[PDB]
Design an enzyme around this catalytic site. Structure first.
Site, PDB file in Angstrom:
ATOM      1  N   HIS A 203       5.515   4.484 -11.212  1.00  0.00           N
ATOM      2  CA  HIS A 203       6.600   5.031 -10.382  1.00  0.00           C
ATOM      3  C   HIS A 203       7.090   6.315 -11.042  1.00  0.00           C
ATOM      4  CE1 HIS A 203       6.819   0.646  -9.831  1.00  0.00           C
ATOM      5  NE2 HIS A 203       7.263   0.849  -8.613  1.00  0.00           N
TER       6      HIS A 203
ATOM      7  N   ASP B 281       9.238   5.617 -13.999  1.00  0.00           N
ATOM      8  CA  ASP B 281       8.627   5.036 -15.213  1.00  0.00           C
ATOM      9  C   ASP B 281       8.160   6.145 -16.147  1.00  0.00           C
ATOM     10  OD1 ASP B 281       8.629   2.443 -14.010  1.00  0.00           O
ATOM     11  OD2 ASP B 281       6.635   2.735 -13.192  1.00  0.00           O
TER      12      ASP B 281
ATOM     13  N   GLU C 182       2.872  -1.520   0.818  1.00  0.00           N
ATOM     14  CA  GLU C 182       2.817  -2.828   0.141  1.00  0.00           C
ATOM     15  C   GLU C 182       3.809  -3.805   0.779  1.00  0.00           C
ATOM     16  OE1 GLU C 182       2.983  -2.481  -4.038  1.00  0.00           O
ATOM     17  OE2 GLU C 182       3.339  -4.628  -4.400  1.00  0.00           O
TER      18      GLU C 182
ATOM     19  N   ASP D   4      -3.057  -5.055  -5.363  1.00  0.00           N
ATOM     20  CA  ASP D   4      -2.327  -5.497  -6.578  1.00  0.00           C
ATOM     21  C   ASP D   4      -2.729  -6.939  -6.875  1.00  0.00           C
ATOM     22  OD1 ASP D   4      -0.827  -3.098  -6.764  1.00  0.00           O
ATOM     23  OD2 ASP D   4       1.086  -4.084  -6.366  1.00  0.00           O
TER      24      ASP D   4
ATOM     25  N   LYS E 273       5.999  -7.311   1.297  1.00  0.00           N
ATOM     26  CA  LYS E 273       6.565  -8.425   0.528  1.00  0.00           C
ATOM     27  C   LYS E 273       7.531  -9.164   1.461  1.00  0.00           C
ATOM     28  CE  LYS E 273       8.839  -9.748  -3.809  1.00  0.00           C
ATOM     29  NZ  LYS E 273       9.759  -9.348  -4.921  1.00  0.00           N
TER      30      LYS E 273
ATOM     31  N   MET F  27      -3.418   6.037  -8.784  1.00  0.00           N
ATOM     32  CA  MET F  27      -2.347   5.674  -7.855  1.00  0.00           C
ATOM     33  C   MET F  27      -1.017   6.008  -8.472  1.00  0.00           C
ATOM     34  SD  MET F  27       0.164   3.239  -7.258  1.00  0.00           S
ATOM     35  CE  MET F  27      -0.143   1.488  -7.678  1.00  0.00           C
TER      36      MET F  27
ATOM     37  N   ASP G 115      -0.573  -5.739 -10.970  1.00  0.00           N
ATOM     38  CA  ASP G 115       0.907  -5.616 -10.915  1.00  0.00           C
ATOM     39  C   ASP G 115       1.420  -6.952 -11.416  1.00  0.00           C
ATOM     40  OD1 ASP G 115       3.543  -5.183 -10.551  1.00  0.00           O
ATOM     41  OD2 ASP G 115       3.461  -4.873  -8.368  1.00  0.00           O
TER      42      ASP G 115
ATOM     43  N   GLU H 252      -0.450  -7.503  -2.281  1.00  0.00           N
ATOM     44  CA  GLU H 252      -0.307  -8.088  -3.617  1.00  0.00           C
ATOM     45  C   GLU H 252      -0.471  -9.586  -3.496  1.00  0.00           C
ATOM     46  OE1 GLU H 252       2.861  -6.827  -6.355  1.00  0.00           O
ATOM     47  OE2 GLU H 252       3.300  -8.958  -6.735  1.00  0.00           O
TER      48      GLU H 252
ATOM     49  N   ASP I 171       4.687 -12.650 -10.650  1.00  0.00           N
ATOM     50  CA  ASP I 171       3.853 -11.630 -11.272  1.00  0.00           C
ATOM     51  C   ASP I 171       3.185 -12.185 -12.542  1.00  0.00           C
ATOM     52  OD1 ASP I 171       4.633  -9.764  -9.221  1.00  0.00           O
ATOM     53  OD2 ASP I 171       5.327  -8.334 -10.723  1.00  0.00           O
TER      54      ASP I 171
ATOM     55  N   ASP J 252       9.170 -13.862  -6.967  1.00  0.00           N
ATOM     56  CA  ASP J 252       7.928 -13.143  -7.313  1.00  0.00           C
ATOM     57  C   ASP J 252       7.680 -13.273  -8.801  1.00  0.00           C
ATOM     58  OD1 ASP J 252       5.928 -11.029  -6.876  1.00  0.00           O
ATOM     59  OD2 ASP J 252       7.398  -9.506  -7.275  1.00  0.00           O
TER      60      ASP J 252
ATOM     61  N   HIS K  96       2.743 -11.689  -3.366  1.00  0.00           N
ATOM     62  CA  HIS K  96       3.631 -11.479  -2.203  1.00  0.00           C
ATOM     63  C   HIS K  96       3.210 -12.249  -0.981  1.00  0.00           C
ATOM     64  CE1 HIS K  96       5.099  -7.490  -4.172  1.00  0.00           C
ATOM     65  NE2 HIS K  96       5.308  -8.546  -4.917  1.00  0.00           N
TER      66      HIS K  96
END
Ligand SMILES: [Mg+2]
Ligand SMILES: [Mg+2]
Ligand SMILES: [Mg+2]
Ligand SMILES: [Mg+2]
Ligand SMILES: [Mn+2]
Ligand SMILES: [Mn+2]
Ligand SMILES: [Mn+2]
Ligand SMILES: [Mn+2]
Ligand SMILES: [Mn+2]
Ligand SMILES: [Mn+2]
Ligand SMILES: [Mn+2]
Ligand SMILES: [Mn+2]
Ligand code: NA
Ligand code: NA
Ligand code: NA
Ligand code: NA
Ligand code: NA
Ligand code: NA
Ligand code: NA
Ligand code: NA
Lengths: 387, 387, 387, 387
Positions: C53, C56, C180, C244, C182, C87, C286, C216, C256, C254, C219
């Site tokens: 992102h 980040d 994406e 993902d 969710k 990406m 992810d 993902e 992950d 979630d 998700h």
């Protein structure tokens, strides 16, 4: 490889391989099986035994001569094969009279009939050698809030199981009861919906030592719960009297997939726990070969239940025996979890500055748990990928 | 209309209206509130009292002089408003030292520290007048199967609660404990995941009378369970020592919506049950005003918790008082459900041909339960649509 | 064994191994990582690349000189390691200004700012070589019904993605977008909650060829859906632009988890499908190393993501290559499923008595599907238990 | 009060009030109803019309003379009552020949038969005046990963619906199709599991204008989704051709409770949306009176479906008409959500410093959304508690 033997105590309900395939939306896809043919086929696969509801063995409404002949044929099949009958149960859910319940129907006359139908089959169970009598109260519950006062229903459910306890004590039987929880289906909500609720209820019975649980993999997963954790609590309480093994894909209608299907890593951790704890009861499958299958697929699906148990048993034993896993368990402090927190007692704990004023919380917080490397060793052992 | 009074025993955690809005994906949206301002604002809305974790009242790591001043300011606010503190609890989940648990951390030093942090706050709770000490073990559990031996963890969890029981007995305190189940979040699976599992665990403590449950509406709904049914089992067991009220939309992350949001008919049947059973404890809200809101929305959301309880109380009382509903309850045989199945005893039941040979199962099966008309009377009363 | 190479196109978000461990209930357990150290460590494990992102890589609110220096250091790390950046994406969820959304915030000024923040980072993505620009609209949605008119929000969501399409066309960029889905979390319900809803929305954009999905694993599993089935529909539509990979245990918050954890057989069938279909995009993780772990556990968990992909790739290839499985696929008529139903056309089908008057429905119904033996061959291949 | 009139376009499937009560665990509790008696009873309650599967009206395997007589009796009942038949559908799920699907069965001969059975009933639907032809592909899917290649199945599912489109075009019929998604049950996973997946699939048909969706309240809730949000996306796409109304308690087996039961606030927001959007299609109930009920409870449950729609219609209209709610909608910026983000166009947005350099993100972030007061006004209107 992985070939089951009666030694392995694998058992199956008559209603499992005998399920004709009727579902909420579809007619039967297979003809009914004679229990004698299911006993002989299961023995040929290496099963140890079968289990039954009364009405799987004896058609509902049979005369006494009909009942005798059905039992006689079944016993000849057991004798011909060496199969055992470790468990039996009552059908208190199929007939329309049980639409609001057996033991907790609002109508008192139905509750009394449900008890008499159960008691008749307890006598039969004992005659066939069963050690455990299961009760899955699939019609006990409600679709709406006013229909069922749950405190009154729990009073009726305790009264019923107390009377059954009085019955087997009075007859000198050694059989014990195992209550099978399920959260929903066919009622919108079922009473005693999880292993925890059933364990708690048992503690309030008049003879609590006569009752345990019969947890089923897919039922706890219909509430999104961790089945190995619930089995651990049942073992901790000394109440794992029987178990139903199958697979389920999460929060859905009860799918009764063959064991090992559904949540495969939960199947691994379940077998690891049963074998580590030395569970000695039947490895019973309550499953349904999908209605897509003909009878060759029925027997393939039953063989797969036992095969997947045995593969998972091998991999869990290899995981526990691997000196690298034993090292990782120590690195993650599983050994400390098994030590008492304060065998020195409360006053010593209160006086111990290392537990409070001198505890370095930031140094403790910095210690990693190394749980991910431990779990990847577990994954590598399950998949046979060590290296 | 529906205006709360302290008479109504509505209470709120400091952490509820004080939640600053940080969530797994987002920073805080509101500044921190001084507990004194939350006490005064909640009193202005008609609340009866507040509750606290230790670290909501006293910043973690405070010196003894700082601790005294925080408590002194809080007590002045309580005195200025007439607010009470019926319940307190320990934060054994936020600080990184508790990442694998407090009472069931694998590291023994952390388990001992968790007990000393709890005991320090039990003393404070008693000084502030609390009757109940809650424990929500949100870090007790695991993300992976090898990380946590659940039988060893239950041994540690019993050892911890036994030591707390010994502590309050030794001090002559009248406080009692209430264990709060949750199925998951923040751990992948949490130990004692439902009301049933917590009730069962309590039965194995050395002084079981000192412990009950603190069920939370949204937690049981994170397992898809019927919250009114679980409260009924807790009442049946005599263990509903406290309750957390909020809303939740099914199987999701713990949303802590205001009470009445989420599953509105389950909120109706919960209030009907609490009021019918004469529950006398606090009506405590464990909720979070959504992080979309400013402080006016915080106080609106807290006012809505109490308003929705009072609307549902009115409608449930009107439902139970309506002679047409009383008739429908008799038509659905709720009166028979409350009668013993066999007060004549086991031998009389065995000898009663009306329970077996002469029971007309098809005539019984033909009787409708009339549950749908009863439920539509309940819907009409909830919506104020009778007519 | 199973050692990843950059050849394998494994990529990781900076926010994955960089997750500091803050969760709804707990503070960070790890210090922040410099993106340069994550790039070098991931390269050392055999990763191909990273993703980011905006916030980040560049702390929110950085000056232009600060932004240049952050990018310069990151590019030196990429150059030093050969890592790629296939990406990038925008953080439109952490800052409080996005509490009701970015592109579908009710406040128009926020929607315009969200677009300008996205466009600035599209330019950066292109400079770093990214082929795909992801958008996960985690704040688009609502906790209550009146808060968000979903038809108006979809109009705003289409307007936003149309403007982004106009932007990249006008600049001659080759990048494409991947939405994406969710279903919930952090909003009570999120807009475009599944792969299906996102695919349908894309069809109504003005330049539909510029947009695909970034599904993902966890998700879709938060809605209890079959992730391999949803990936198959995305491939069928020509819209699987990115993916993902992670693990999830059913209908929860979630989680992950590392790839291969959670639903292991769904991970097997996903890898089988990606490899059979020849998916050529990044295998992007992810995921979040659990907050129980220190940095050695972070890198172990990242290594496990790639290892489990490679083990599952080997087993799925062995399953598809096994002449016994090819036989079983024919026995279950997978070859017929791939043939047209009626390449002879509608009039020929209408005139074909073998499709109606002369179709023997009972003989067809008697044919078993042999799906259970096929699935047990698949289980045996996954577990390396053939024999 | 709340008395339905045919004006209200309430319709019911023959299979709803005609459901005999067989469920996965239990036999039928009610006798079969003659469609003529269901038409007359529903008219007496104020219904507008009925709908049918072919095999609800004409027993499977009927001769042509039998088919004529069944249709003739049904048409006399419609004529005697003024009831209409706005929708019809095919049973492609009950007979064992459809155990792996109709249009996507692996066996090609079954796929061709499924099309011919559908086409025969499309002709009948048109003769009876139906505007919509529903397809719920409840057997399309799988219990295991190898059994069903989903890209091949989607090719077959598109081929089938394209041939049906060609058929109705060639016959000059005005009927249109409505695909009904469901996520699972009776297959372990069903293809096109949600409204989104069905909308996306329709976009790839050769004549997309002939197909819409028939969403069902409980089916989207079996994936934990927001049903009003999914209906909003269907309306946004211009594809809400029909709807099935009922109730469901979350992620369970398909309960088909009467409308208004299950998630009551989702029922409120659904009715608000349908009425605000001016949906003009049938308000069709796909529900099952619970098998606890006799025929008086069947008709009570059907009457309750319509009553709850009408109560919710009144309360949603009062909410939208209340000047205090209109004020609160403006306070929460619902009016801005309906305005374009950037009708000034992309270059103006890029050049607008108020969207980036001069946007005060902290002042924007400080603005509360006032969603909680808006939602409590909505709760007060639903419960008739304003004041
Ligand atoms: Mg040990
Ligand atoms: Mg009473
Ligand atoms: Mg192919
Ligand atoms: Mg408008
Ligand atoms: Mn089951
Ligand atoms: Mn079972
Ligand atoms: Mn909560
Ligand atoms: Mn709570
Ligand atoms: Mn995720
Ligand atoms: Mn992602
Ligand atoms: Mn349905
Ligand atoms: Mn339907
Ligand atoms: Na009672
Ligand atoms: Na045991
Ligand atoms: Na121990
Ligand atoms: Na109590
Ligand atoms: Na609009
Ligand atoms: Na693609
Ligand atoms: Na194909
Ligand atoms: Na429409």
């Amino acid at each position: 490889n992985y070939a089951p033997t009666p030694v392995d105590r694998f058992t199956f309900g008559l209603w499992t391989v005998g399920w004709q395939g009727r579902d909420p939306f579809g007619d039967a896809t297979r003809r009914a099986l004679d229990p004698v043919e299911s006993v002989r086929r299961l023995a040929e696969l290496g099963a140890h035994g079968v289990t039954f509801h009364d009405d799987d063995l004896i058609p509902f409404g049979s005369s006494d001569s009909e009942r005798e002949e059905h039992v006689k044929r079944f016993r000849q099949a057991l004798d011909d094969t060496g199969m055992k009958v470790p468990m039996a149960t009552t059908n208190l859910f199929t007939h329309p009279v049980f639409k609001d319940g057996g033991f907790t129907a609002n109508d008192r006359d139905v509750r009394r009939y449900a008890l008499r139908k159960t008691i008749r089959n307890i006598d039969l169970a004992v005659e066939l050698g069963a050690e455990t009598y299961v009760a899955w109260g699939g019609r006990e519950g409600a679709e709406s809030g006013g229909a069922k006062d749950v405190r009154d229903a729990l009073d009726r459910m305790k009264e019923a199981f107390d009377l059954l306890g009085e019955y087997v004590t009075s007859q000198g039987y050694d059989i014990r009861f195992a209550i099978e929880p399920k959260p929903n289906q066919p009622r919108g909500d079922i009473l005693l919906p999880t292993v925890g609720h059933a364990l708690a209820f048992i503690e309030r019975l008049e003879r609590p030592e006569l009752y345990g649980v019969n947890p089923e993999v897919g039922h706890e997963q219909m509430a999104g719960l961790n089945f190995p954790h619930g089995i651990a609590q049942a073992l901790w309480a000394g109440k794992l009297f029987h178990i139903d093994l199958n697979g389920q894909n999460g929060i859905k209608y009860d799918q009764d997939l063959r064991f090992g299907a559904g949540d495969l890593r939960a199947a691994f951790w379940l077998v690891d726990l049963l074998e580590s704890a030395g569970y000695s009861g039947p490895r019973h499958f309550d499953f349904k070969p999908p209605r897509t299958e003909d009878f060759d697929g029925v027997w393939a699906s039953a063989a797969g239940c036992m095969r997947n148990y045995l593969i998972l048993k091998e991999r869990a034993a290899a995981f526990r025996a691997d000196p690298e896993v034993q090292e990782a368990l120590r690195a993650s402090r599983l050994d400390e979890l098994a030590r008492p927190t304060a065998a020195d007692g409360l006053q010593a704990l209160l006086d111990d500055r290392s537990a409070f004023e001198e505890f370095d919380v930031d140094a403790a917080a910095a210690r990693g748990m190394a749980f991910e490397r431990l779990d990847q060793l577990a994954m590598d052992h399950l998949l046979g990928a060590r290296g």
